[model samples]
Target chain A: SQLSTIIEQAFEDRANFTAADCPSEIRQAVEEAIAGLDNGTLRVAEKINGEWVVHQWLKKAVLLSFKLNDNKPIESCDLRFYDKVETKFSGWTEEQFKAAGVRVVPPAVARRGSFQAKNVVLMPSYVNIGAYVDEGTMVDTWATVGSCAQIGKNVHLSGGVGIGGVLEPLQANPTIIEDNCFIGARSEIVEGVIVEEGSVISMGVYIGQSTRIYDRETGEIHYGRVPAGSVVVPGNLPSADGKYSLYAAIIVKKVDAQ
Target chain B: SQLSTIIEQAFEDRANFTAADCPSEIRQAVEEAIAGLDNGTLRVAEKINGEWVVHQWLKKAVLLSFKLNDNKPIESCDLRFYDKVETKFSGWTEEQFKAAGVRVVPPAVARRGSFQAKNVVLMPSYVNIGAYVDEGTMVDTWATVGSCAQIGKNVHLSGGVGIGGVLEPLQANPTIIEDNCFIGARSEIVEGVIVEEGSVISMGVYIGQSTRIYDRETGEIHYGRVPAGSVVVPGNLPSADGKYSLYAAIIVKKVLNDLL
Candidate 1:
């Protein structure tokens, strides 16, 4: 609550503040707030009372961090990169990773303010600040867990998957993938769609907020959200003019509760 | 002929050797073999007698190289990596790239044993060992050219396309995409499927050995290979039980050679 109040006040005065002009106390507060996020003490979003809620103040805190920090050189091999934020691997060693119970394969990068729970395997993926990747998740090669996106436990994000980032609308939902989901290779789930638990999305399926989800058996059309335990695949539906087909997701079957 | 015989013998004796036990003569032979691949003097697969032929000896050399070398650290930005391979950029300088006539955006990894011909454009893609990308090919972001895969001239492997690898049958074919092909984004052609020259595959299509290829015009079903000058798109076919549809590739049209 204290961090929220501090971040709210800072966001209101963000335009006036700079890395040089900002007070050290406010800087420390933001740093500590983000550090809290990095260690799983705080999260950007959470489910409460059967609905997902975004913590606007924490998002504001992340937003304010960009203004407060200055770009610096980051060392890489045979490549050049300069960024304002430090990588999660900046000070990491094998002992620290082993203690955290996470496996970070080479070339994977998570920023300073993201929390990766134990048993999460990262294979050359990117996890941005303020994101939460829960235990037993596989962030596969070339996948991106965008800023502030919430990924639940036992999830498998196959190669080249993109969970897009968003920081606005305070009350609007960010992208969320619930527990036990298998997102097939090269698929993208962006624009704040929440894939509920135990769903299987086939390869190359792209889901966005306005993208329609067609139920083949019932001929029902849904939007923005995939129901729990649904098996999804990519398909096309005839356009209104009947001239061509448009891409849409098909809910082929529902998984039985075991 | 000597190199081929040596590589064949080395492959036969591969299980007995490690990096420590590997003899210098055989190691030098493997190095030269891969270097031949790197400079385009040799290829893992090529069009011969109007058919793609696998060079089993060369593939054997690439596999034997793993036993000849040891894993060492490779540098990456803000990350740690240790592998037996060095990236193509390891000793590359600006003048060398300019002289070779190619564009390599940052984060792209081309292993030492792979070849990229002049005028190729690589965008953060991965080209594995023994792969050959001919001149003017565009390897778009996040694409992968698996080991020994052959990409022909001026082909565009769009974002997230995976041309899969094979290390087996020793004589079995590796994936091949012929000249003037446009492989659409997020598509995968695995299990050594050969996409013939001048074909256009649409986005999200996945083709493997078991996947069926349907020609809409002829109502015929083909498998494992895409004909030349074909335009392919993703669609669903009726399942055997008629309960639901299954994914399949459709030949939408055939482009003329002139159009190609």
Candidate 2:
């Protein structure tokens, strides 16, 4: 517990320490990091200092010490280069932003962390403020968690999944995905759309704003909001697969947590 | 010099060394590494007996270590978590490929060590295999070097640059950018595109296959090639604000290196 506290302090107290004053205790930790060298409670904190050249150190550490795990030492590495700005303002700062460039930024609050009661994994991609990720969820690589969006647990966001952000125009509604959702790779759940949980979004499905989601169980095709626990996937025009048609997300199943 | 040679030998003879017989010289090198306490140089070599981590500690052992100013390490840490694979098939085994998770690969002849040139900087979010990057080059973030692509010395591949790979579709031609070139951000040179030495590919410029570059002084857009030592930027386009849109690419000025 003390080690965990010290490790936590490494991130919280990062702004204060200089490269010269880098704690030797951390170095000792790395040296003694061999497998079973100590109890799992032994604390190790990695600080990404300006002069330390984190990339080089990371390579050496992984090569010498432990097999690289499922994490880059810092979650802030991805956002180290990008920013959170509105689309309307994108063109405004194009010139000045390009010239001045950006490095460090003050941490902002995450909008909504509420979700279904379950375990979840949030990868390196940007999560906008007020995004709700429910239980048994794994948001995989390069997926964007849009602001004011509601996601149910047991939902899987494959690589490059995009959930539209909607913080601005504060009156706008949030995209809601009720329990048991599975969004496939490179799919888009956008525009305050309500997807009832137990919905399985197929790979490469793009749900545009105001797009109608048909429920196969009821043979109903209409715009806005699928019922709770609906399974949705990409389908051909009017549930018919052929040429001269468009793609739509249709409910394929209805399930509940077992 | 002897120590450096020994370090090199340790890397080369890594397959033969047994855990019980780790040479005293190697142990001395490891001690120096542990004593020096620099975290960047210590490397885990391989696992021995499925229990102990075999270490070849290559601190200050690289050829470019002593030559550079303060032993400049490679800048980009692209794909560190990426699985490194070396394999062979049809005269090429899986063991040959250095980086892992490669879906498609070219012949072994194209996979040889081509980054022979020194002072190179490979930036993050970039991919490179089967190419030769000469010394004094900076491959910036999100830039890619295709197989058999020959990049000349002292080149600066600014952000989001793409040097086309000829691996797919069995194309033998490789993109060649001669020495002292500046490829700006988001520039794409595809399909055996050759940028003559001392030319600049400006930001957001896309150079097509066999697209002839025009000489500014000559005022002729030839289909063959652009003259060497030219400063090229994308042409201006009109915006919604009644401003011109930026075109793909255009030669702006000529550069005489001797004057510098």
Candidate 3:
């Protein structure tokens, strides 16, 4: 409770403090919160009873960490990198990864404060800080899991997919992909959209708040969310007069209920 | 190059050779060819006298390397990798990059035998082996220049774009993107398709051999190539029965003659 209270207060009084001016305990509390996030003790958003409730105070701690830290050069590989947050594997040993049961293919990078559970295979992808990836998930080659996003167990984020985040004043909801969801290659789910359990997105489909999603069977339209068990594909909705068509995600089928 | 002759003969007799028993001259020739590809001396596809030609011998050399080499653990960074192809940045120096006038942002990787010309910028992307990227090009974040693909000068491959390649048995001819083309984000140009000079492709467009590209004014459908200076976008063609629409790439407009 004190940790949450301090971060909430620090966030409210963020303008009054600088990297040099923050209280020692405030910085210490932020670091503690970040460690909790890294170790999966704290989550930015989680399911409670039925709904996903965002812990804003944890998010505040992440924001405050940015306000209190300065960008420095990352230990250079063949290429160069300069960023504020540290890489998740910065001080990791082979034994640590073996114990964690995580497979980090070469060039895959996860920033600190992100938690990916055991049996997760990261294949040359990027996971931004504050994201939570659950067990048996595969973040495929060139995919990105943005900050504060929630990915459930057994999810397959395919190659070049983007699971975006919402960490802002205007956007409130975080992007979420529930259990057993298979996002196709080059697909993007952005703008805090949620894909419920067992949704299979086809290749190159883009689902965002700005995009229209429709069920061809029921002829019903949905925005910002893909219904559970929906088999979605990229297509265009024809204009009213049949002159032109605009991009849309068509719910082609639904998986049988188990 | 006399190197091409050795590789050409080796590819003809490729079925007889294994990693354990090559002609010894075959592996040596393949290494020489790969080195040429890395150093920008030999190109997989080149424009000779206004004709784009595919030297199938060099492609065979790339394919042969897979048979000759075995997957082994690459130099470990934060993670481990097991791959037959050596990384392009392996054994590279700061001075080598500075001399080449290339900027490799962290985690961007180019496999060995890929050639990126001077003044190229690689931003957290992957360039496969035997690919050729010409001068002043930018391979942006999450984009992939696939195996043996050819890219010309000043091209911009936007984020999440896939420039696909054809290296093996069924698919022939390398994917080609000519000079000054601007490909928007999330687009994929695959299956040995050739995009001529100065094409501007909009976002989320997928153009493969199966795709139908049509001119809005002419209504003429193109099969596998984008004509020079065409501006393409993602669209769909309505079914004959008016039941459904299939995906298509529409040539919305064309750039000016002076644009190239």
Candidate 4:
């Protein structure tokens, strides 16, 4: 309660502070929040009851923490670039990796504030800060999990997939992929979309807030969320005269129990 | 020339050679071929006299190179994986990067056999072996250029795009994206598809050998290639019953005069 209280008050008086003149107490509080995010003690969003809840104070902490950092040269394998974020395992030893129970393949990059649970295999993918990837998940080659996105357990994100985050434009909610989801190659799910449990998304399907989720069975159109056990594929909705059709996501069928 | 002839012979008898028992002369020739590929002196495929020609011999050299090398641990930044190919900039120093005029962000991986010309910017992407990325190209974040694919000058491969190569499943022709093209985000052009020069491909468009390129302007359907100066977008065709529409690439309009 004290942690939340400090962050809540700090975020309200945010305009008064600067990196050069911020108070030590507020800085220490923001650092503690970041450490909690890194170790999975605090989540940006969590599923409570039947609804997903957002922790605004924690998000403000992340934003304020960014303000406190200065860009520095990243001395990685032959790379010449500068960014404030550091890779998660930058200074970890072999014993630390063994304890974490994670396998990081070549070129995989996970930012420091991301929480990847035990038994996760990352394949040359990128996981940004504030993201929480749970156990037994396989992030395939060229895939990216964006900031504050919540990926559940036993999920398989196929090659070249992208799960959008809330950081960039700062959306209200986080993109949540519930348990046992299979996201196909080259697909994209953004804009705080919630894909419920046991969903199978096909290749090349792009789902944003503007995209129409066309359910053929009931002729219903869904936005912002996919129902549980949905098998989604890429389709197009025709124009008034049928001269052309634009892109849409079609709900083909409910997935079978595997 | 003689190089092609020797690789042809070696490819025909590929089963006989093992990594340990391969002849020194053959290994020397393969290394020479790799060096030529690395320095942009040779290409796996090239456009010659209105035809895209495939140098089968160069591809054989890349394949033989994989056979000759054993899997070893890659000492990247805290990564613990094994692969035979080395990153192109593995041994390159600051002077070499400055002279070549290329920029590489973190976590970008380009194999040793791939050739990237001057003024190329790679933004955390991957370029596989036997690929050729030409001058002033920007390979955006998370994009991949597949093996033996040829990317032309002043092209922009947008984020999450995939330009297919010939090596996987070993197709006959290489995928070619000609000069002055803008490929949008999350698109894929695979299976030896030749995207002609000065085209604009919109987002989430996937084109393979089997995908039909429907040109609404002329009511014509093209396969295997997109014409020069065409503007393409993602669309779908309905089934007979109109129950659902499947994915297809639609050529909406011709490029404006200034684009050509």
Isolated chain A TM-score, each model: 0.96, 0.51, 0.96, 0.95
- Model number with the top TM-score: 1
Q: What digit string (tens of lDDT, one per residue) describes model 4 on residues A1-258? A: 898888889888888888788899998998898889888899999999989988888888888888766677776455566877767777776666777777676677788888988888886788999999999999877889999999999999877889999864543888999999999778899989999999999778889999999998888998999999999988888777877777789998896576
**RMSD of every prediction:** 5.4, 20.4, 6.5, 6.7
For model 2, the stretches where C-alpha displacement exceeds 4 angstroms are A1-258, B1-116, B210-214, B236-246, B256-260
Q: Which candidate achieves the best DockQ against the true structure? A: 4
Ranking under TM-score, best-scoring first?
1, 3, 4, 2
How far out, in Å, is residue B107 in model 3?
8.4
Compose the digit string of candidate 1's lDDT tens values, residues A130-153. Answer: 899999999876889998899999
**i-RMSD per candidate, Å:** 4.2, 19.0, 3.9, 3.7
Question: Taking the tens digit of each residue's C-alpha lDDT, what string does model 4 give over B65-168?
Answer: 98888655555554344456776888798998998878988768788889999999999888988999999999999898988999999999999898876775
DockQ of 3: 0.17
Clashing pairs in 3: none
lDDT, model 1 = 0.84
Model 1's DockQ score? 0.20
Candidate 3: RMSD over Cα atoms? 6.5
lDDT of each: 0.84, 0.47, 0.84, 0.85
Report lDDT (Cα) of residue A225, candidate 4.
95
